[PDB]
Amino acid sequence: ALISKKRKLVADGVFYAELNEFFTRELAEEGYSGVEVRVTPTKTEVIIRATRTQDVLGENGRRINELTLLVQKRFKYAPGTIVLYAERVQDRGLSAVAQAESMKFKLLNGLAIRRAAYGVVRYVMESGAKGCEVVVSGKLRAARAKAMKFADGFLIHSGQPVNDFIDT
């Protein structure tokens, strides 16, 4: 559409980032972890990887028609040129995003952090993971803040294996 390739691929990246923060803000109480966009001839499909597909798909297509209409109205798509599917994250314990959200919803329910963080660490480690680490930083009933870690197993910190085998 008379745009450069350098600007078209950058704009595709910005569209992906904007949908990522939009679904991160919207679908946070039903465990959205990721989004994948497939641009096809006269369709673009948006796959939402979530831990709970039933509260992404709503009932009778509510809350997926809402997101399809919201996304096509913001990004100015013609109707039926963008479609939204949902699929459930298999091996939920190996997802760092989902475990961060599960810890966040544990701590907003008023639950102690050495219970919550260890209950995430053991769940990840018997979900079939090589290693797990949880760091909690902030202030908890004291003004003076501290940070505290909860690590079990084996972790790599340096090199291309971090980009390969580590979710953060």
């Binding site: 803000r25 509510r62 028609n65 809402e66 919201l70």
Partner: protein, 96 residues
């Protein structure tokens, strides 16, 4: 202030007819895309509905997403005087 009745009606009937409204957080844009009124009128009419219930709002990168609740459909049907329980508007109307 004076949002006139015709402009509040054409905000609320777009919201019923499409189900959702997106607005850019751009006051002084003064013409919303797909609603025939000012962007700030759209923002503040949907704020007025949000504060009394009736729609849920989200913000996300300066773009103001509004979606109707179930109390929203039973208020806008009363307000805009649409046929009683025939019209969802628009979830779900045309795809089942």
């Amino acid at each position: 202030m004076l949002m006139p009745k015709e402009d509040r009606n054409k905000i609320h009937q777009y919201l019923f007819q499409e189900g959702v409204v997106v607005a850019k957080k751009d006051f002084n844009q003064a013409k919303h895309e797909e609603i025939d009124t000012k962007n700030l009128y759209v923002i503040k009419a949907l704020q007025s509905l949000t504060s009394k219930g009736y729609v849920k709002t989200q913000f996300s990168w300066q773009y103001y997403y509004y979606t109707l609740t179930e109390e929203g459909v039973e208020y806008l049907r009363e307000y805009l005087n649409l046929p009683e329980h025939i019209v969802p508007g628009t979830y779900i109307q045309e795809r089942n």
